[PDB]
RNA sequence: UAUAUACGUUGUAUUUAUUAUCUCGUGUAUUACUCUAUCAAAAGGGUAGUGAAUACUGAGUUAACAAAUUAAAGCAUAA
RNA sequence: AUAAACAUACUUUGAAUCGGCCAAGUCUGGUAAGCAGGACUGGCGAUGCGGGAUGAACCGAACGUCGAGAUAAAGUGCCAAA
């Protein structure tokens, strides 16, 4: 039940996202970068990784 | 016959130590195990020092008219005459060193683009080869 | 979904020729070959995650884990010391452990 | 109030490496001055991670 | 995680005891090992020196009952298994489980001939040996002490080389054509946006 | 391995290299991919067809809390 | 010079013991002995622990129950931590 009532206010506050969504699409490949999960592939050692 | 020798004037590449992947020139041979390398400190940054041969690798360049105990003043003059820096950058080792410097300054986002692009290009290049 | 851990092998307990101290476990992290690459992992989280075949009438979880921290290196070859909430079972020697990326300092 | 790291600044893109949304990427807005935690929106139109 | 894969070590151009020491340590680290061509391993000393060492080994035998005594296996794959077993814990479950993950075969059998092969730089003969130090292959020593299947392995290996010689020849033709098709894509006019990223990071 | 010449192609093996999910859009091409048929075969085989994945190459929906390996009992028939 | 007040000086009453053995930049008898007998000291007996694979005496070091660290002898291919 609580999720049902809290949903209308949780959704509303996502008006914050309207600026950041538009600015994400401006940079090429940034939109795909943000949606995908971050993973450690083969050969990426955390002590050598710069983010 | 062997092509690369440990001699005076032979340009060597440091493999380990604080000056790894830096160019150097042999200026005097102490014995079979040690040589004196003075890859111009004003150019490459490797000071005149004694190095065991196990910690360097010979290249295909020999500086002309380099004699035993050649001074750093004159060695720098002959080092830039043969354009060892220009020529070395065109070799497989020269590009291998440059690539490693390029890769070590890649963040997560840059590695993300390459993996996406390289996967598509490699897959596209596989599609373009017919099977008959 | 994604990999956010590094396989560390439970090498054994901190020991001597004839004694053994199960308070500290020695892990060999994958990709760490020298003690000079160890400072990154000092303070990181480590979990020994194991599977137990529970019965249907039992409410115990099927997947359990023991959590701990990397505290110090052990020798010049990238082996580290880890302390866990409960000492690891010596039947898990040679098994893989998860080294996480938190507590993050980046 | 926890002192933030120098790298965490408003607008920086973070990577969550623990918890429910592990591996996801979020946008840092500001710090919760009443709790010291980071207020992040992994823009729901993109990540599916809410405020 | 779990290590379900097999590390295949090509025992060609390696030293018997240095291979065994590295494998016996990693067998205790949960890894699964297969040592193909455990007959091409090298040991120090000429054949005459090795045969004398074998004779000393063959002497150890229970006097009152040789069937209880030491069993002296002649197969090179069993020569390596004896070496590896000596570097593993004795008479405990830890050392039995470690040895259950190891196999040599005298050649490359059906599943392991199309797997990725590994090398142990510590155990390479070209590193740890003076070139003029005379060595012996485990196969050559095995035949001198009574290994009957030396020429069966040679026949099976000869077939394996000739099958891989045409697989590699065919695969090379495909890779050369793919590399050319990749050069037309990289130099294509429409792919400029993607290639620019590749060159900027040194991938093109 | 003192390896024809040339190059030294440097500088992280396994575990551990897929851009979240689903739907929408048309054909081609590719595959140590799956299955069927056939010729063969102690083959990462050939031929034909089919599907799957990917590129050309799109677009859209959704996510907010939650959740995301064997146990217990029998003896009719058959070898 | 240095140290020394839970210092120093003791008094009474009493136990057990006086088969010893080992080491050695020592000695005597003996060809010699894991032999016999001695001078000085340290030990074992009475003593576990870390090391020398094993060992009464060797080396390090002497022990209430524990935690974390720097260490000693000695070690760092595997068994076995490095």
GROMACS .gro file of N, CA and C (backbone and C1' of nucleotides) in nm, chain E residues 21 25 28 87 89 94, chain G residues 77-82:
model
   60
  361UNK      N    1   5.711  -2.788  -0.964
  361UNK     CA    2   5.704  -2.701  -0.847
  361UNK      C    3   5.597  -2.593  -0.864
  365UNK      N    4   5.218  -2.592  -0.660
  365UNK     CA    5   5.174  -2.480  -0.579
  365UNK      C    6   5.036  -2.433  -0.621
  368UNK      N    7   4.734  -2.645  -0.525
  368UNK     CA    8   4.689  -2.612  -0.391
  368UNK      C    9   4.613  -2.480  -0.385
  427UNK      N   10   5.573  -3.288  -0.424
  427UNK     CA   11   5.569  -3.148  -0.382
  427UNK      C   12   5.434  -3.108  -0.324
  429UNK      N   13   5.117  -3.195  -0.016
  429UNK     CA   14   5.107  -3.250   0.120
  429UNK      C   15   5.073  -3.398   0.118
  434UNK      N   16   4.384  -3.246   0.185
  434UNK     CA   17   4.425  -3.131   0.104
  434UNK      C   18   4.514  -3.174  -0.012
  700G        P   19   6.379  -2.023  -0.220
  700G      O5'   20   6.286  -2.100  -0.323
  700G      C5'   21   6.204  -2.030  -0.415
  700G      C4'   22   6.121  -2.125  -0.498
  700G      C3'   23   6.022  -2.210  -0.420
  700G      O3'   24   5.899  -2.143  -0.398
  700G      C1'   25   6.149  -2.348  -0.564
  701C        P   26   5.804  -2.184  -0.275
  701C      O5'   27   5.761  -2.333  -0.307
  701C      C5'   28   5.657  -2.361  -0.399
  701C      C4'   29   5.618  -2.506  -0.394
  701C      C3'   30   5.582  -2.559  -0.257
  701C      O3'   31   5.449  -2.531  -0.219
  701C      C1'   32   5.734  -2.707  -0.359
  702C        P   33   5.413  -2.515  -0.064
  702C      O5'   34   5.443  -2.659  -0.003
  702C      C5'   35   5.362  -2.771  -0.037
  702C      C4'   36   5.408  -2.897   0.032
  702C      C3'   37   5.419  -2.890   0.183
  702C      O3'   38   5.294  -2.901   0.248
  702C      C1'   39   5.609  -3.000   0.093
  703A        P   40   5.273  -2.832   0.391
  703A      O5'   41   5.346  -2.691   0.378
  703A      C5'   42   5.326  -2.590   0.476
  703A      C4'   43   5.419  -2.473   0.457
  703A      C3'   44   5.455  -2.438   0.312
  703A      O3'   45   5.468  -2.297   0.300
  703A      C1'   46   5.652  -2.475   0.435
  704A        P   47   5.338  -2.203   0.280
  704A      O5'   48   5.335  -2.114   0.411
  704A      C5'   49   5.252  -1.999   0.422
  704A      C4'   50   5.325  -1.883   0.485
  704A      C3'   51   5.436  -1.823   0.400
  704A      O3'   52   5.386  -1.720   0.317
  704A      C1'   53   5.518  -1.869   0.618
  705A        P   54   5.420  -1.717   0.160
  705A      O5'   55   5.531  -1.604   0.149
  705A      C5'   56   5.535  -1.497   0.242
  705A      C4'   57   5.677  -1.459   0.274
  705A      C3'   58   5.774  -1.470   0.159
  705A      O3'   59   5.769  -1.359   0.071
  705A      C1'   60   5.868  -1.570   0.351
   0.00000   0.00000   0.00000
